[PDB]
């Protein structure tokens, strides 16, 4: 679909606020994305994968550093995503540290 | 005077301080050799007159 | 059809894998938001910009809370 | 230099150097501080990298 309504879908996913209920936030999203729209990073998933491993080692979720080794091959195996480096660089930036806690559910 | 002395001294002082901070930054990446910056700032004066302004994308 | 559902199968796999990655990394985004992020990544998008947008919108859900 | 360990051999004082561990939001500095007791030479065969990786978990604990 068109990217303008997609940037609107982001701001109504995060907030409970419409494009009319706030107009500054949705204006600010168009301000930030549309000046540097195309990525400045190229395909370097390998380096960021070895930091996701290293991040799950620091939390002692050491089975999930080896579960991610299956998942990172699965992500390339499907191949329906245009940039595989971007989404991992996004999820790694939003990471948090409990203190050393290991919590598991799924799979 | 105040325009044949003072304005030129002010201009010199600005350029010398700005370039000095740029040198001390452009040398700190290189790796000892940072002991010149250590010895030069023995009081702790002029140890933060510039840091690079950060931005993403 | 079937080949139109096999691609629906091959997209349902990667949206489950990225969900597993989202929960073991303890991010804020859920399954529904992740699809907006994946569509943006089909368009071609800078993560250094997208992360600042997500850290701007969430700041105004911690100010209007 | 402050404590009484400057009379030690020069080799072991070289083998230590701290290694940082990667930053995350909400990560405090006590969790990311670990010595690295790196070694090269023929003496590396007894003290391999896998051994050092298992020592750092002890040091962290």
Swiss-Prot record, chain A:
- Membrane spanning stretches: none
Phosphoserine modified-residue sites: 107
Q: Identify the tissues in which this protein is expressed.
A: Ubiquitously expressed.
Where does the record say this protein resides?
Cytoplasm, Cytoskeleton, Microtubule organizing center, Centrosome
Q: Which domain of life is it from?
A: Eukaryota
Q: How does this chain assemble?
A: Component of the gamma-tubulin ring complex (gTuRC) consisting of TUBGCP2, TUBGCP3, TUBGCP4, TUBGCP5 and TUBGCP6 and gamma-tubulin TUBG1 or TUBG2. TUBGCP2, TUBGCP3, TUBGCP4, TUBGCP5 and TUBGCP6 assemble in a 5:5:2:1:1 stoichiometry; each is associated with a gamma-tubulin, thereby arranging 14 gamma-tubulins in a helical manner. Gamma-tubulin at the first position is blocked by TUBGCP3 at the last position, allowing 13 protafilaments to grow into a microtubule.
Role noted for this protein:
Component of the gamma-tubulin ring complex (gTuRC) which mediates microtubule nucleation. The gTuRC regulates the minus-end nucleation of alpha-beta tubulin heterodimers that grow into microtubule protafilaments, a critical step in centrosome duplication and spindle formation.
Per the record, the similarity remark reads:
Belongs to the TUBGCP family.
Q: What is this protein called?
A: Gamma-tubulin complex component 3
Q: What's the encoding gene here?
A: TUBGCP3
From Swiss-Prot, chain B:
Cellular localization per UniProt: Cytoplasm, Cytoskeleton, Microtubule organizing center, Centrosome
Q: What does the entry state regarding organ or tissue expression?
A: Ubiquitously expressed.
Q: How does it assemble?
A: Component of the gamma-tubulin ring complex (gTuRC) consisting of TUBGCP2, TUBGCP3, TUBGCP4, TUBGCP5 and TUBGCP6 and gamma-tubulin TUBG1 or TUBG2. TUBGCP2, TUBGCP3, TUBGCP4, TUBGCP5 and TUBGCP6 assemble in a 5:5:2:1:1 stoichiometry; each is associated with a gamma-tubulin, thereby arranging 14 gamma-tubulins in a helical manner. Gamma-tubulin at the first position is blocked by TUBGCP3 at the last position, allowing 13 protafilaments to grow into a microtubule.
* Pathology linked to this chain's protein: Cortical dysplasia, complex, with other brain malformations 15: An autosomal recessive disorder characterized by global developmental delay, variably impaired intellectual development, speech delay, facial dysmorphism, microcephaly, and varying degrees of cortical malformations including pachygyria, thin corpus callosum and subcortical band heterotopia. Most patients have generalized seizures.
**Role noted for this protein:** Component of the gamma-tubulin ring complex (gTuRC) which mediates microtubule nucleation. The gTuRC regulates the minus-end nucleation of alpha-beta tubulin heterodimers that grow into microtubule protafilaments, a critical step in centrosome duplication and spindle formation. Plays a role in neuronal migration.
Q: What family does the database annotate?
A: Belongs to the TUBGCP family.
Q: What is this protein called?
A: Gamma-tubulin complex component 2
Q: Which residues of the full protein are shown?
A: 814 to 876 of 902
Curated annotation (Swiss-Prot), chain C:
Write out the annotated subcellular location. Answer: Cytoplasm, Cytoskeleton, Microtubule organizing center, Centrosome; Cytoplasm, Cytoskeleton, Spindle
User: Signal sequence: where?
Assistant: none
**Highest taxon listed in the record's lineage:** Eukaryota
Task: Please tell me whether the keyword Acetylation is annotated for this protein.
Answer: yes
Which key words are in the record?
A: Acetylation, Cytoplasm, Cytoskeleton
Name the major location. cytoplasm
Q: Which residues form a coiled coil?
A: none
List cellular component terms (GO): centrosome; cytosol; gamma-tubulin ring complex; interphase microtubule organizing center; spindle
Role summary: Required for the recruitment and the assembly of the gamma-tubulin ring complex (gTuRC) at the centrosome. The gTuRC regulates the minus-end nucleation of alpha-beta tubulin heterodimers that grow into microtubule protafilaments, a critical step in centrosome duplication and spindle formation.
Q: What does the annotation say about its assembly with partners?
A: Associates with the gamma-tubulin ring complex (gTuRC) consisting of TUBGCP2, TUBGCP3, TUBGCP4, TUBGCP5 and TUBGCP6 and gamma-tubulin TUBG1 or TUBG2; within the complex, interacts with TUBGCP3 and TUBGCP6 to form a luminal bridge with actin that stabilizes the initial structure during complex assembly. Interacts with TUBG1.
Protein's name in the database: Mitotic-spindle organizing protein 1
Report which part of the complete sequence is shown. Answer: 11 to 75 of 82
């Amino acid at each position: 679909k068109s990217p303008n309504v997609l940037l609107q879908n982001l701001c109504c996913r995060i907030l409970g606020r419409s494009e009319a209920d706030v107009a500054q936030q949705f204006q600010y999203a168009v301000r930030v994305i549309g000046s540097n729209f195309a990525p400045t990073v190229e395909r370097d998933e390998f380096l960021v994968a070895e930091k996701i491993k290293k991040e799950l080692i620091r939390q002692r979720r050491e089975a999930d550093a080896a579960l991610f080794s299956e998942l990172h091959r699965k992500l390339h195996s499907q191949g329906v995503l245009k940039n595989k480096w971007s989404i991992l660089y996004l999820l790694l930036s939003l990471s948090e540290d409990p203190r050393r806690q290991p919590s598991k559910v799924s799979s | 005077l105040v325009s044949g002395f003072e304005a030129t001294i002010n201009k010199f002082d600005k350029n010398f301080s700005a370039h000095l901070l740029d040198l001390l930054a452009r040398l700190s990446i290189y790796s000892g050799m940072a002991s010149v910056i250590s010895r030069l700032d023995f009081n702790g004066f002029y140890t933060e007159r510039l840091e690079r302004l950060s931005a993403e994308r | 059809a079937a080949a139109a559902a096999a691609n629906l199968n091959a997209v349902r796999e990667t949206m489950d894998v990225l969900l597993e990655i989202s929960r073991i990394l303890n991010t804020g985004l859920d399954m529904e938001t992740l699809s907006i992020c994946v569509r943006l990544c089909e368009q071609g998008i800078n993560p250094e910009a997208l992360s600042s947008v997500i850290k701007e919108l969430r700041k105004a859900t911690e100010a209007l809370k | 230099r402050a404590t009484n360990a400057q009379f030690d051999s020069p080799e072991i004082l070289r083998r230590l150097d701290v290694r940082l561990l990667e930053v995350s939001p909400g990560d405090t500095g006590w969790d990311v501080f670990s010595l690295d007791y790196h070694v090269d030479g023929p003496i590396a065969t007894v003290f391999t990298r896998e051994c050092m990786s298992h020592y750092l978990r002890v040091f962290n604990f």
